[PDB]
Amino acid sequence: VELTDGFHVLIDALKMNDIDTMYGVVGIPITNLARMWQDDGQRFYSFRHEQHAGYAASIAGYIEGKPGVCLTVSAPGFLNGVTSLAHATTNCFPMILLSGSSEREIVDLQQGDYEEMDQMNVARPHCKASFRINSIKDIPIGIARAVRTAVSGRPGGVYVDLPAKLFGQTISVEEANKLLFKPIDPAPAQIPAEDAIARAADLIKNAKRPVIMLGKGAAYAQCDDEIRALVEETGIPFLPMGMAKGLLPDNHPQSAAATRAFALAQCDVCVLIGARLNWLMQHGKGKTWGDELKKYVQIDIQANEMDSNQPIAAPVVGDIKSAVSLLRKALKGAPKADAEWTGALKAKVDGNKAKLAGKMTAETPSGMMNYSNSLGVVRDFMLANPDISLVNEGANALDNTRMIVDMLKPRKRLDSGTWGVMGIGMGYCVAAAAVTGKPVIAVEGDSAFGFSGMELETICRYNLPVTVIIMNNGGIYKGNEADPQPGVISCTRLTRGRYDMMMEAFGGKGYVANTPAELKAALEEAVASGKPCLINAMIDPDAGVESGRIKSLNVVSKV
Amino acid sequence: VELTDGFHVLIDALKMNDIDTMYGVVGIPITNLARMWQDDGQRFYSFRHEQHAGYAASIAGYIEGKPGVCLTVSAPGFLNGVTSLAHATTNCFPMILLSGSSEREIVDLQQGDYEEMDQMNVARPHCKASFRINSIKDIPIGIARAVRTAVSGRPGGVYVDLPAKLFGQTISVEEANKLLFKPIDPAPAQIPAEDAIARAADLIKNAKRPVIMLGKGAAYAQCDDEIRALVEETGIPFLPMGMAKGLLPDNHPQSAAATRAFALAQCDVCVLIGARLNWLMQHGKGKTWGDELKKYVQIDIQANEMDSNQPIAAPVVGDIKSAVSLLRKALKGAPKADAEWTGALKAKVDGNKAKLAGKMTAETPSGMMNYSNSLGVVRDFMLANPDISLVNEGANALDNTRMIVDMLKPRKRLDSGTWGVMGIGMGYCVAAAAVTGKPVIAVEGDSAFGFSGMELETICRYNLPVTVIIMNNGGIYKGNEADPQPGVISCTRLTRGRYDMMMEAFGGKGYVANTPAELKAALEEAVASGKPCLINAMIDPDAGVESGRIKSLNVV
Amino acid sequence: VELTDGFHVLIDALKMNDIDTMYGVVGIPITNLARMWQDDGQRFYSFRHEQHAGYAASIAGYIEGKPGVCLTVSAPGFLNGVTSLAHATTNCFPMILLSGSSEREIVDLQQGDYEEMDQMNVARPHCKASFRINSIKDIPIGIARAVRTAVSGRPGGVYVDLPAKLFGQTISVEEANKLLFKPIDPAPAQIPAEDAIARAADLIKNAKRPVIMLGKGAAYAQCDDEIRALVEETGIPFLPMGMAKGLLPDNHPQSAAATRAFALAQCDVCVLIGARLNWLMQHGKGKTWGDELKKYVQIDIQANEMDSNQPIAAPVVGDIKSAVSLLRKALKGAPKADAEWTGALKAKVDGNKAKLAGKMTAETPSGMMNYSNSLGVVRDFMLANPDISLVNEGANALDNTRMIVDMLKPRKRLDSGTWGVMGIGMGYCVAAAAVTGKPVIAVEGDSAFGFSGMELETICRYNLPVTVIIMNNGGIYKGNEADPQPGVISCTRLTRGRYDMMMEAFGGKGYVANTPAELKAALEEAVASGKPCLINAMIDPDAGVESGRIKSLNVVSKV
Ligand SMILES: CC(C)(COP(=O)(O)OP(=O)(O)OC[C@H]1O[C@@H](n2cnc3c(N)ncnc32)[C@H](O)[C@@H]1OP(=O)(O)O)[C@@H](O)C(=O)NCCC(=O)NCCSC=O
Ligand SMILES: CC(C)(COP(=O)(O)OP(=O)(O)OC[C@H]1O[C@@H](n2cnc3c(N)ncnc32)[C@H](O)[C@@H]1OP(=O)(O)O)[C@@H](O)C(=O)NCCC(=O)NCCSC=O
Ligand SMILES: CC(C)(COP(=O)(O)OP(=O)(O)OC[C@H]1O[C@@H](n2cnc3c(N)ncnc32)[C@H](O)[C@@H]1OP(=O)(O)O)[C@@H](O)C(=O)NCCC(=O)NCCSC=O
Ligand SMILES: Nc1ncnc2c1ncn2[C@@H]1O[C@H](COP(=O)(O)OP(=O)(O)O)[C@@H](O)[C@H]1O
Ligand SMILES: Nc1ncnc2c1ncn2[C@@H]1O[C@H](COP(=O)(O)OP(=O)(O)O)[C@@H](O)[C@H]1O
Ligand SMILES: Nc1ncnc2c1ncn2[C@@H]1O[C@H](COP(=O)(O)OP(=O)(O)O)[C@@H](O)[C@H]1O
Ligand SMILES: Cc1ncc(C[n+]2csc(CCOP(=O)(O)OP(=O)(O)O)c2C)c(N)n1
Ligand SMILES: Cc1ncc(C[n+]2csc(CCOP(=O)(O)OP(=O)(O)O)c2C)c(N)n1
Ligand SMILES: Cc1ncc(C[n+]2csc(CCOP(=O)(O)OP(=O)(O)O)c2C)c(N)n1
Ligand SMILES: [Mg+2]
């Protein structure tokens, strides 16, 4: 009687659920799983730290809508990956963290096993579900549960614990072929009731000053044509959230992005599509909303997200494609949005964009670029080459890039997200590169960059078409904070380092850009090369503000 | 300018979400919330332990389809209640545990506050969501979140922590009104796609030996006519789980319940409606399903319940009403289930029902009834008087009542549930009585009863129309296990006590029933009286088996 | 080769660690463990609810100083027991909760097993350690870990999970006899350094107005003669906490119990022996301490209890017997406490006790006793028969009994404890009765009593010499609160029930006491009978105050 083993039943189970890629770091007891994945003919990206392997999995899930799969070792490795899972879950990204674990008997008596942890129970606050496959026969059901939990409902992270002893267990090949199966419809449509849609349609039809807010949930849904058709048919101005940029082209004539403050403050009806009223929208209260409760229409797959922050006049619960399709039919033939409202916003948009053009044009000393003229080069490049992933994180490097760099295409901009995480940079590059088969540009704050910088080597090791732009201003927010005491460096200072040399140390191409013209040539050459590059863009130490746009949220002393 | 406080904002917020009743036990810091709730004109049921106030909340949620609300105090009080919240969440019953809590400053530094516990964090395993309302301005939103989490998606338990310092906060009446609001559509319809339904419909159409399993999820949905119309148009044999009894009347001619083993073992397609393929269904494998993988259609609101145990050939995700109405239109005009299959099951049901009648008809010595002839009395009474709730727990007393007592009306049978909880009895009685305003009958095993027994006094204090029947066999399973050592009583033995005397200690009516005739006359008189009663039914000590139907789950 | 099994290896392991008693409720999968415990020749007390089985274990640990052992089923049963474990842990009582659990494979994939719960992980907030013995060979090490964790350091509750499949596992008898072992010195002495003791000795020697506070930690330590010798040699006034009553006789001439307010408010040095500065002492701050930081000396085995609430001038860390023995030698030969201080307190004590004697003497209508004249009968009885356990809980029934009922002997008074738990009544009776082999009296509030009342049957089933006194006033605090609306009973009302009849229903003896003289005869007759009794003492519905002594802690409306 012929036999297979846990390694292969897991390999096959993952393949049966359409996983052909993992991101990880090897070591006991999962090295030979990693090897066999590759022997079988599938991709493994080995990283320098499991956190960045996990950030990668997380954004592969966002981009593709199937779970990014991260593989780690026990206790210390798991723990590094679970920090990313946590991130996945918070951002609603389908992701599965698989981690080897030690011996049940010793761990449960807390005797001091190798890398001892109840990893299943430690993951619980950080995922939707935390499972463990103890037995070879349950691998296919276990992976099915993991894939459904990650992709269904509100998508998110799932932990699957893989005890050391799972892998060497054996089972007949006949058995395993019966047990192996592919879940039917793991992320199903969920259609809202007619009256939910009618309540929304009523509010929109009667709006004097309506605005649509698209979040990364809408982007994730992959119904770009449906959403655009809704915005166009209704004539409603729209505002994208950070990662919703490009869902509709950022230069769409109905965009009110360039006049956000006025739009939100003065609107009567606000239509939220896959966007939470969390801190990024100031919870639907205070100055930013004109000190009043708007009439919120909200489309979301999570029923109890409704009324989380402010009352929602027209809650629509279901998947965005299903809901938007119905809302469109419900609004079909109705008058377009108030022309004096859309005109008022269009005038503001033009006036504000003209003022930004004047900033991107201004001239600075060599090695002392500002955020406008430097990122204005990236803007121009991304308008000409839109089919490229734009990774972004930092304070001033994030806020100024979201404002300046226009995305014409969807699921391309990949940023710090719901938690404002510094660290997602290089993992996001690796994953974007792996899943898209196309170039990647990263605009990195230099502090931001340090949280995943060692993964330059990983980017080089896989010869990926990634171009890292370091907005090198020599610190956190600024690089010129005075020494607190004689010969003591300030806590916000960084070395104004030669990150180009660091990249060259691992076989990458390095550049220093001291002027907008130098940055242009370097970026054009780097992207066209198709090779791992890093551009060290020299930004004025005094150019940025404390925390960028969110300087209000700081706690300062007054006594 | 006129003020209101935390107590009143909470009361208003609760009322705005259609809550008019709470079950609880008062004390620091929430006694005055309880009082003011009553002063306002709302109901408060005080219990003798918070666990049973909790079980009462849970089943009120089930029956009504809106959160049962339990109110407790900090640490020890909270813990008692969260045991019940945990049970609710496991059973999918909407419920809100409100518990007062102590000083943040002192609790967070673990300094030894009064009844110190991080109740919010201790609640998390036992509920869908654990919240804390710290500030008066957030009460309307906090209560909206609790209600929506309890009733939307898979319904279940929510914990809301109410720090002592919440209640004494003030705010302008003008502000309070502005903040107070009513959630729109807190338990929304969720509709499945055409092709999820069409896949299910084709599985059913080409079935040769189909079966419909109805779970308490289907009973909870309150779409009794949709589900009955589905059964009667397809002509498919059906089977109810313990609390799905009465959804269709248990004597409906398409019921294959009395030949369950053969139906599950021999079916090819199995349509699960609001029922999990959990231990109660042998996880969809083993001897009870004929040692093969069936083609499953499953209708459930929780997407990731699919494939939890066995591959599901046709997963239909959505609320049962929406799914069933669509599935009905998809199957309309299609031929009925194969006649040789439905005729074969009907024949085995008839023969098995005849065997049971012989057991019920038979005669035993006075004071030594068995489970058949004793529960035959309850069967007849519930066929003649079906608009009565039936609470049931125990081992032999549960399993035999589920088999013998036919339910003809939906959401009446209220039993141990997914966790096989001994302890739900008297709390279930108080809630069922409170929310229906109609009579209740409890069939309680004597061990089962002792978990909530002291709540007899609660039932008497509120003068509720509850008749408690104790299956007094003198122990757990059996009342005659021998002393392991000389003069040492065995662990399964219970005093064969005068539970009737206990009932009468608190003002209720007691009966001792030694024969079926005595049981019948007592039950008829008790139910007609509309007073709190207890019938001490004297059962043969040797009439039980080990653990009832689930004897095989024991480790020897 | 001869074989034993998991049932017996556990039975033997428990016996090897000196457990001969368990308190529990049976059912799957632990019934046959319960049976075999008894077959082997050991005690099992079956209860009506696992909570009260657990409260029993908890107080058996306090009284004996070896872990009380509670046995339950999976999920629902475990959960009821863990509520008591939590109580054990909070109060510092050595206790082990053993619970059967379901199938690892199904539970870990959350498939819906019979009574499904990760009981190991659910217990964690409620015990010192939460373990699981998965394998037969680890049973003796597992039980050793449990016994050491419960009795060592600060004592407390330990959870031990017993998977269904543990019990039918087999092992040679030879193997099991080698593996079986008895821990050496599981609750060791811990001696404080000479300078810790000298710092305390200095503070005491210089005190003008010193007071010693004994807590139940000191009582638990079982060094009654050492502690009494310290109090007598130094001449320092002393105050017992609730369960420290009787450690020294409550009528000791150095007791300042009857003048607590003045003693605490006016002292300079306060010596805390196994007593926390928690809510029971108002955290060492405010009015009760004269709005000043005393010079605290504190003896405790838990190092980091020190400075938990207020700064501790002389922290002494170690076991109380070891610490007191050294402090005595350090103070030996020194002058006794200031005579004008001890005299001032002695005058207050006499004046206050005379005023209480006048209350216990007053006359009331039949069926309308107050708390003074009713409990004054119990006082007189407990002075004449001191070798009896006194269980107590309630609001006015607790506060008035602690004040009035004097304990001459140690570890006899057993009350609501650190959390003020209503529910410990009948389990405490069963356990006290089981471990002492002597009579038990309970003074129960009627609300308090309802939380464990059904365990009257258990008390009767084991024919235990327990006398339950129900302070029957018809409610919580009072029994006369007006109907809030017409025909609606107030939330604090209870039926003024015939609890005597309830007791008679299960073979117990019942009494109604309408007068102090009737209560006296009943109590005298009940205790001497040696049989399960209940006295229904009829107390005036209007006699008590809201929450007793802790009415300040209530939250009342003012708007
Ligand atoms: C919280 C926010 C959503 C709040 O939004 P705002 O910053 O107020 O608006 P933004 O959309 O970012 O745009 C800022 C302003 O630029 C304007 N804007 C936008 N696009 C344009 C163009 N194309 N041309 C001209 N002006 C433009 C826009 O109208 C705003 O002006 P007005 O209309 O005048 O307002 C955002 O700051 C955000 O997403 N922050 C993420 C912060 C983070 O994660 N940080 C990690 C580092 S933490 C650091 O300590
Ligand atoms: C696990 C189960 C779902 C398994 O279902 P079964 O018991 O096998 O089926 P049931 O529907 O109860 O029916 C039992 C048998 O009686 C038959 N049956 C049912 N109704 C009738 C009538 N009206 N007349 C004649 N026969 C009948 C039915 O065909 C079965 O025989 P066959 O077809 O021949 O099988 C059930 O036992 C259950 O719900 N258990 C919960 C137990 C629990 O939680 N207990 C708490 C105590 S724990 C104690 O230790
Ligand atoms: C928190 C406390 C330690 C605070 O102590 P106090 O109540 O202030 O002091 P107590 O020692 O209880 O005694 C009260 C008063 O009686 C006096 N006293 C004590 N003994 C005597 C005798 N023998 N004779 C005369 N007077 C006496 C003592 O000096 C006090 O008066 P003064 O010197 O004048 O103060 C205590 O209340 C306590 O242990 N409470 C437990 C509460 C609980 O757990 N409740 C559960 C139900 S919760 C209800 O809602
Ligand atoms: N397919 C989908 N259909 C509907 N809603 C979705 C879908 N996928 C994710 N969501 C929801 O989209 C929302 C994303 O919001 P958020 O992460 O706050 O976006 P942003 O930060 O861009 O505002 C979440 O509330 C999530 O439940
Ligand atoms: N309105 C509803 N629509 C769809 N599914 C529901 C609804 N209410 C509850 N459910 C589902 O019903 C199921 C209840 O199953 P279970 O408690 O195991 O029933 P039983 O014990 O009767 O088999 C759960 O899976 C739950 O998610
Ligand atoms: N053998 C021992 N030696 C020293 N300290 C002990 C010993 N056993 C318990 N303790 C300590 O005694 C203290 C008991 O305090 P607590 O429960 O607050 O008493 P009370 O409530 O009577 O004031 C705990 O801090 C505990 O760590
Ligand atoms: C994990 C993590 N650590 C710390 C922070 C706080 N934080 C926000 S921005 C930032 C760095 C900003 O500096 P930089 O990336 O260089 O951008 P700049 O303002 O200089 O352009 C840090 C550390 C964070 N958001 N996440
Ligand atoms: C809280 C809790 N504790 C224990 C159990 C285990 N258990 C199952 S049935 C049962 C009692 C069965 O005896 P009884 O209620 O008298 O029914 P009988 O078979 O005697 O008719 C117990 C204690 C449980 N399910 N829940
Ligand atoms: C588990 C638990 N629930 C609730 C409380 C709050 N509580 C304190 S005292 C009390 C009852 C007091 O009434 P009773 O026992 O009859 O004493 P009385 O004042 O009437 O003498 C309650 C419910 C508590 N301490 N513990
Ligand atoms: Mg910087």
Ligand SMILES: [Mg+2]
């Ligand atoms: Mg029984």
Ligand SMILES: [Mg+2]
């Ligand atoms: Mg009372």
